[PDB]
Design a protein around this motif. Structure first.
Motif, short mmCIF file in Angstrom:
data_model
loop_
_atom_site.label_atom_id
_atom_site.label_comp_id
_atom_site.label_asym_id
_atom_site.label_seq_id
_atom_site.Cartn_x
_atom_site.Cartn_y
_atom_site.Cartn_z
N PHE A 1 -2.43 15.52 10.89
CA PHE A 1 -1.47 14.53 10.42
C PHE A 1 -2.20 13.30 9.90
O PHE A 1 -1.91 12.83 8.80
CB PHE A 1 -0.48 14.14 11.53
N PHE A 2 -3.17 12.80 10.67
CA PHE A 2 -4.03 11.70 10.25
C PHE A 2 -4.65 11.97 8.88
O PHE A 2 -4.60 11.11 8.00
CB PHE A 2 -5.15 11.42 11.27
N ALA A 3 -5.22 13.18 8.74
CA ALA A 3 -5.94 13.56 7.52
C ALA A 3 -5.03 13.63 6.30
O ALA A 3 -5.39 13.19 5.21
CB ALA A 3 -6.67 14.87 7.72
N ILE A 4 -3.84 14.19 6.49
CA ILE A 4 -2.88 14.27 5.41
C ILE A 4 -2.31 12.90 5.05
O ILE A 4 -2.26 12.54 3.87
CB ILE A 4 -1.77 15.29 5.73
N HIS B 1 -3.73 9.95 5.48
CA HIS B 1 -4.77 9.10 4.93
C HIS B 1 -5.07 9.43 3.46
O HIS B 1 -5.28 8.55 2.63
CB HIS B 1 -6.06 9.22 5.78
N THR B 2 -5.09 10.72 3.17
CA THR B 2 -5.37 11.20 1.83
C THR B 2 -4.20 10.88 0.87
O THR B 2 -4.41 10.43 -0.25
CB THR B 2 -5.72 12.71 1.89
N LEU B 3 -2.97 11.06 1.35
CA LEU B 3 -1.78 10.79 0.53
C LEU B 3 -1.61 9.31 0.23
O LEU B 3 -1.34 8.92 -0.91
CB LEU B 3 -0.52 11.34 1.19
N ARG B 4 -1.76 8.48 1.26
CA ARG B 4 -1.70 7.04 1.12
C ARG B 4 -2.79 6.50 0.18
O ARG B 4 -2.57 5.53 -0.54
CB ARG B 4 -1.78 6.37 2.49
N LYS B 5 -3.95 7.13 0.19
CA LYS B 5 -5.04 6.72 -0.71
C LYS B 5 -4.81 7.14 -2.17
O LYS B 5 -5.08 6.36 -3.10
CB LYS B 5 -6.40 7.22 -0.20
N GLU B 6 -4.30 8.34 -2.37
CA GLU B 6 -3.87 8.76 -3.71
C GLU B 6 -2.71 7.91 -4.29
O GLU B 6 -2.76 7.48 -5.44
CB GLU B 6 -3.49 10.23 -3.72
N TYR B 7 -1.69 7.65 -3.47
CA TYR B 7 -0.40 7.16 -3.98
C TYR B 7 -0.03 5.72 -3.60
O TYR B 7 0.77 5.07 -4.30
CB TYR B 7 0.73 8.14 -3.61
N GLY B 8 -0.61 5.22 -2.51
CA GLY B 8 -0.43 3.84 -2.10
C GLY B 8 1.01 3.43 -1.87
O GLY B 8 1.70 3.99 -1.02
N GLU B 9 1.45 2.44 -2.64
CA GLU B 9 2.84 2.00 -2.66
C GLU B 9 3.84 3.12 -2.98
O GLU B 9 4.97 3.14 -2.48
CB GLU B 9 3.01 0.91 -3.71
N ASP B 10 3.42 4.05 -3.82
CA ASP B 10 4.36 4.99 -4.41
C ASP B 10 4.64 6.21 -3.52
O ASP B 10 5.09 7.23 -4.02
CB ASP B 10 3.91 5.42 -5.81
N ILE C 1 6.89 9.75 -4.18
CA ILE C 1 6.46 11.16 -4.22
C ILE C 1 6.81 11.92 -2.95
O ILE C 1 6.15 12.90 -2.60
CB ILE C 1 4.95 11.33 -4.59
N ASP C 2 7.87 11.46 -2.28
CA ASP C 2 8.46 12.18 -1.13
C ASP C 2 7.52 12.44 0.06
O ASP C 2 7.67 13.43 0.79
CB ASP C 2 9.12 13.49 -1.57
N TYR C 3 6.56 11.55 0.28
CA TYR C 3 5.85 11.59 1.54
C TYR C 3 6.35 10.50 2.48
O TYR C 3 6.05 9.32 2.29
CB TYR C 3 4.33 11.48 1.36
N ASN C 4 7.14 10.89 3.48
CA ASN C 4 7.45 10.00 4.59
C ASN C 4 6.71 10.44 5.86
O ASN C 4 6.90 11.57 6.32
CB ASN C 4 8.96 9.92 4.85
N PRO C 5 5.86 9.55 6.41
CA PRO C 5 5.04 9.79 7.60
C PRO C 5 5.85 10.36 8.78
O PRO C 5 5.35 11.19 9.55
CB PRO C 5 4.52 8.39 7.94
N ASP C 6 7.09 9.91 8.90
CA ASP C 6 8.11 10.55 9.71
C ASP C 6 8.93 11.25 8.64
O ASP C 6 9.80 10.62 8.05
CB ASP C 6 8.97 9.49 10.42
N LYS C 7 8.74 12.55 8.41
CA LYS C 7 8.44 13.54 9.44
C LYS C 7 7.25 14.45 9.10
O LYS C 7 7.42 15.55 8.60
CB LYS C 7 9.68 14.39 9.58
N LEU C 8 6.06 13.97 9.42
CA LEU C 8 4.91 14.82 9.62
C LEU C 8 4.89 15.09 11.11
O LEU C 8 4.10 14.49 11.83
CB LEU C 8 3.64 14.08 9.23
N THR C 9 5.80 15.95 11.58
CA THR C 9 5.87 16.27 13.02
C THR C 9 5.41 17.67 13.36
O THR C 9 5.10 17.97 14.51
CB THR C 9 7.28 16.06 13.64
N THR C 10 5.37 18.55 12.37
CA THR C 10 4.95 19.92 12.65
C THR C 10 3.77 20.32 11.79
O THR C 10 3.46 19.69 10.78
CB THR C 10 6.10 20.94 12.44
N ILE C 11 3.09 21.39 12.21
CA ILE C 11 2.00 21.93 11.43
C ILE C 11 2.57 22.52 10.15
O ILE C 11 1.93 22.49 9.10
CB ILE C 11 1.18 22.94 12.26
#
Length: 136
Positions: free
Chosen positions: A20-23, A25-34, A38-48
């Motif tokens: 979860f950390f790795a995904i 960190h990488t997404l936030r670095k690619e997309y930042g504010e946006d 691009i439909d990444y909400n940290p909640d819900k990265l709850t499952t593998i």
């Protein structure tokens, strides 16, 4: 046998947190504010399964680059085998689980800082020894 479950959830739940950390960190670095855009909400990265779906959805844009020196292709993340998606119920499954994700976390950390990479090695060592310190 007896001793199994505490180290089962221990690896499983730590592997989960590290994916979860790795995904994240990488997404936030690619997309930042946006990232909402691009439909990444940290909640819900709850499952593998969520994580895998993220690697799948962002493969061409972000994740395949991290996997260049791997034989892993896009389709691997479409639907992971259940052994890789859930808490190991036996020793074979636990080794299979840990070995797959150890290799994968390496690629997912491949552009992180030297520090974060050392931190991953340290965590991997603890996983192995806690596993490799069970024979019957």
């Amino acid at each position: 046998p007896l001793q199994f479950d505490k180290v089962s959830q221990n690896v499983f739940e730590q592997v989960k947190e590290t994916i979860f950390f790795a995904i994240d960190h990488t997404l936030r670095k690619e997309y930042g504010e946006d990232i909402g855009f691009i439909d990444y909400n940290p909640d819900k990265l709850t499952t593998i399964e969520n994580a895998s779906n993220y690697i799948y959805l962002f493969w061409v844009s972000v994740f395949s680059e991290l996997f260049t020196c791997s034989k892993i292709k896009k389709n691997e993340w479409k639907s992971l085998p259940t052994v890789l998606k859930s808490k190991p119920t036996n020793l074979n499954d636990l080794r299979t689980f840990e070995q797959f994700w150890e290799t994968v976390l390496h690629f997912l950390f491949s552009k992180f800082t030297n520090e974060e990479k050392q931190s991953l090695e340290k965590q991997i060592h603890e996983w192995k020894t806690s596993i490799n310190a069970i024979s019957t």
